[PDB]
Amino acid sequence: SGFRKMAFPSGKVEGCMVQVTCGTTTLNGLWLDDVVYCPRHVICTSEDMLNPNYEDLLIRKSNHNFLVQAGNVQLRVIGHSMQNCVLKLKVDTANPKTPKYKFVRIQPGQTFSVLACYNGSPSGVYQCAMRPNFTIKGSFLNGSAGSVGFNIDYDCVSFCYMHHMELPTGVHAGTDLEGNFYGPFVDRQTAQAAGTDTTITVNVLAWLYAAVINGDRWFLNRFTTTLNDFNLVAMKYNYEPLTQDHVDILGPLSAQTGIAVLDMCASLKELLQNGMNGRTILGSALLEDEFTPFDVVRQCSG
Amino acid sequence: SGFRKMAFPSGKVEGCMVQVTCGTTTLNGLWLDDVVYCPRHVICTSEDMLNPNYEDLLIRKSNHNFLVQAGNVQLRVIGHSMQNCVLKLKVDTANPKTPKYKFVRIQPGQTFSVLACYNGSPSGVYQCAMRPNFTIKGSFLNGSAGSVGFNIDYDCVSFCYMHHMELPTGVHAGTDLEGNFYGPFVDRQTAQAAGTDTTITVNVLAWLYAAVINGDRWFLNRFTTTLNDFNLVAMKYNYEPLTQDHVDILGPLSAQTGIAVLDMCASLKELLQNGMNGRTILGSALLEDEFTPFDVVRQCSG
Ligand SMILES: CC(C)(C)[C@H](NC(=O)C(F)(F)F)C(=O)N1C[C@H]2[C@@H]([C@H]1C(=O)N[C@H](C#N)C[C@@H]1CCNC1=O)C2(C)C
Ligand SMILES: CC(C)(C)[C@H](NC(=O)C(F)(F)F)C(=O)N1C[C@H]2[C@@H]([C@H]1C(=O)N[C@H](C#N)C[C@@H]1CCNC1=O)C2(C)C
């Protein structure tokens, strides 16, 4: 038992991380087969980052302007192109540690692991969720662009996120691996702001089930509610509305604990209207929404 | 910016994880050079686990009672011995992925990453602290014994923990890699209980500095206190007393923020006596004590 914010083991991704330098800008790249993927703003100076014209900037570069290092070994760039907000660098050597992989775009509410890297070197791994406003609450410093987010499915790495920038509220924005931003952001140093965020209700319910599985039961009650009555109060507290598909997704956890979904919604309703009043749930004094139903099953079942 | 519970990248450890079977008991082992380390209770049946005599149990086994699998490959056991609570299995093949490593015993208050494994297969990575009562608040299911805890120093993996068992409060106990338990526990299925835990004060102060570095300043005040006046109130709230060496250790964070240690102790004193009153710090409504000063510097500096 126990319950922790758990990341996927990162070894399969560590073998793909490289350093990419162009000019005096160094950031991280992802080396799969004979292609290195990295944020396109590697081709920018500080002058360019306020209003870059990336088409112009790219035609002014040649292959030998790109310095790619995989640890000690230099990789020779033999071709480049830009796909939306990423650069694709063709190199002369295919990465022998290329895992089975795919590129997937995730949805708000889903979680993934982040391998934070600097100068091509992995520094740390942590779990986060894609927020409803398409930002992530990460931990990133200068030089972290090109760090990637991923899930592991069986033997297969699904890459879902490449880091680009930090917004002024201290949250983070990036693209999928095809270079398309999550959310309404652009890779230029202008005034951009995230929209208002909401709490991911299905995830909160999943975490309440994790609590019951681990013996925290004080918030339960014998009441029940309906989907519409619950959604009515949830709107008022900036919670995402709950769908029948969410109820279905919580099925395995309902079965394991013998507590029906709409039963646990009535518990959540009371916690929203009355607070915790100084008690905790799984060691937290706030309602946690960055564990999916799948995360909970994976950790509380295996 | 941002602040997350961050684990070390696990790749260097993933390459050392093997599956160890003896009888119908399967658990994890650590394969370094030509030795596999695993919990000695792998040699137990369910009968034996209530009152094992491990000397007797071990002499009744031969090398061929031990099935060791590194993924697909079988390793041939050519010798065994017991060192305190671990078993050392000599195998015919040295692990070619052996990293530079050392065995270190950590102190209460220090943090490390855990690579949770089942059947020799890495499942997840998370950060935890060794509590003052020598337990860890982990997340472990049946089959997880032999999972290891580690820090990475430069190119060198320091192994500090091997998982053995869960106590009845749902916390976890294990040994260093020389087989010596942390805390007053034994590897038999008897009634054992952890002593009372306390809050790790130097870590709470480190986390308050992380908060200031990230722009959370509401809890600051212009007051100051002395080490003895602070320690006097901390005792009453089950906080570890603060030493001059702790003050020294917080130096880099004091310098970076321009807020003296004893200055921030006065802030902590007020938070203990008055609570948060519904505000949060770095997204938490409770005082967090599982980040060391080094963790904070590492994440808020690099
Ligand atoms: C003001 C700030 C935080 C420097 C800027 N932010 C915005 O202009 C805002 F609009 F998003 F607010 C921004 O992040 N960048 C500007 C420039 C890089 C991108 C950038 O410096 N990347 C960093 C890299 N490697 C990662 C950043 C640094 C702090 N922590 C991170 O995650 C471009 C091409 C977008
Ligand atoms: C009651 C319980 C939790 C099964 C027992 N606990 C105690 O007897 C207590 F005294 F600690 F309370 C215990 O853990 N074990 C008994 C047996 C194993 C050790 C054991 O089953 N290991 C597991 C393995 N692989 C890891 C455990 C399972 C749940 N989560 C973990 O971490 C020995 C040789 C100590």
CATH number at residue B35: 2.40.10.10
Close Cβ partners of B153 (under 8 Å, ≥ 6 residues apart): none
- The owner of tokens 């790219």 is A58
Instruction: For residue B5, give the nearest of A5, A141, A172 by CB distance.
Output: A5
Asked whether the beta carbons of residue A10 and residue B6 sit closer than 8 angstroms, the reply is no
Q: Are B20 and B43 in contact (CB under 8 A)?
A: no
Interchain CB contacts (distance < 8 Å): A and B: 121
Contact between chains at A122 and B9 (C-beta distance less than 8 A):
yes
Token pair of B298 as six digits: 């590492």
- Are the beta carbons of B278 and A285 closer than 8 angstroms? no
CA distance B104 to B82: 19
Residue B254 CA to residue B247 CA, distance in Å, equals: 9
Distance CA A104, CA A85 (A): 16
A2 CA closest ligand 2 atom index: 30
Handedness of CA B64, B69, B75, B79 (dihedral sign): negative
Q: How far apart are CA B11 and CA A7, in angstroms?
A: 13
Task: Among B189, B190, B192, say which to mutate for ligand 2: greatest number of ligand atoms within 8 Å of CB.
Answer: B189
Residue B195 token pair:
């002593």
Maximal C-alpha separation, chain A: 69
Residue A205 falls in which region: left (phi positive, over 0), alpha (psi -120 to 50) or beta: alpha
Strands lying side by side in the sheet with A17-22: A73-75, A66-70, A17-22, A25-32, A35-39, A86-91, A77-83
Look at residues B109, B205, B169 and name the one whose alpha carbon lies nearest to residue A2: B169
Distance (Å, whole) CA A100 – CA B120:
20
Which residue of A5, A121, A125 to mutate against B (max B Cβ within 10 Å)? A125
Single out the residue of B181, B143, B153, B175 nearest to residue B37, CA to CA.
B175
**A157, A11 contact by CB (below 8 A):** no
Domain that holds residue A32: 11-91
Cα separation, B188 vs B229, in Å, equals: 44
Strand A111-118 and strand B17-22: the pairing is unpaired
How far is the C-alpha of A158 from the C-alpha of A98, rounded, in Å?
13
Pinpoint the alpha helices (H) of chain B.
11-14, 54-59, 201-213, 227-236, 244-249, 251-257, 261-274, 293-300
Q: Cα dist. B202→B205, B217, B280, B289 in Å?
A: 5, 18, 20, 8
Q: Are A102 and A159 in contact (CB under 8 A)?
A: yes
Residues in chain B closer than 8 A to A302 (CB atoms) = 118, 123, 141, 143
| Nearest ligand, measured from the Cα of B172 | 2
Technique that determined the structure: X-ray
Cβ-defined contact of B124 to A10 (cutoff 8 Å): no
How close is the Cα of A176 to the center of ligand 1, in Å? 17
Closest to A7 (Cα-Cα) out of A106, A141, A128, A134: A128
Residue B2, chain A, CB below 8 Å: the answer is yes
Count of Cβ atoms closer than 10 Å to residue B135 Cβ: 24
Per-residue HEC secondary structure of A139-195 comes to: CCCCCCCCCEEEEEECCEEEEEEEEEEECCCCCEEEECCCCCECCCCCCCCCCCCCC
Cα B259 to Cα B242: distance, rounded to the nearest angstrom:
17
* A140 chain-B contacts, CB cut-off 8 A: 1-2
Alpha helices (runs of H) in B138-226, residue ranges in sequence order: 201-213
Nearest CA in chain B to A283: B286
B121 has which bridge partners?
B118
SS3 assignment for chain A: CCCCCCECCCHHHHCCEEEEEECCEEEEEEEECCEEEEEHHHHCCCCHHHCCCHHHHHHCCCHHHEEEEECCEEECEEEEEEECCEEEEEECCCCCCCCCEEECCCCCCCEEEEEEEECCEEEEEEEEECCCCCCECCCCCCCCCCCEEEEEECCEEEEEEEEEEECCCCCEEEECCCCCECCCCCCCCCCCCCCCCCECHHHHHHHHHHHHHCCCCCCCCCCCCCHHHHHHHHHHCCECCCCHHHHHHCHHHHHHHCCCHHHHHHHHHHHHHHCCCCCCECCECCCCCCCCHHHHHHHHCC
Among A128, A285, A268, A278, residue whose Cα is nearest residue B281: A285
Query: Which ligand 2 atom lies nearest to the CA of residue B187?
Result: 35
B167 touches chain A (CB under 8 A): no
Atom of ligand 2 nearest to the CA of B52: 34
Q: A153 has which bridge partners?
A: A156
> Which domain CATH number covers B291?
1.10.1840.10
Paired strand residues for B39: B86
From the centroid of its chain, how far is CA A244? 25
CA proximity to A162, closest of A143, A181, A137: A181
Distance from CA of A163 to the nearest CA of B (A): 13
Token pair of B169 as six digits: 């409060």
* PDB resolution in Å: 1.8
Q: Is A220 on the interface with B (CB under 8 A)?
A: no
Contact B125 A123 (CB under 8 A): no
Q: Are A253 and A203 within 8 A, CB to CB?
A: no
Residues B194 and B134: beta-carbon distance below 8 Å: yes
- How far apart CA B208 and CA B220 sit, in angstroms, is 10
Distances (CA, A) of B288 to A139, B5, B200, B262: 17, 11, 9, 19
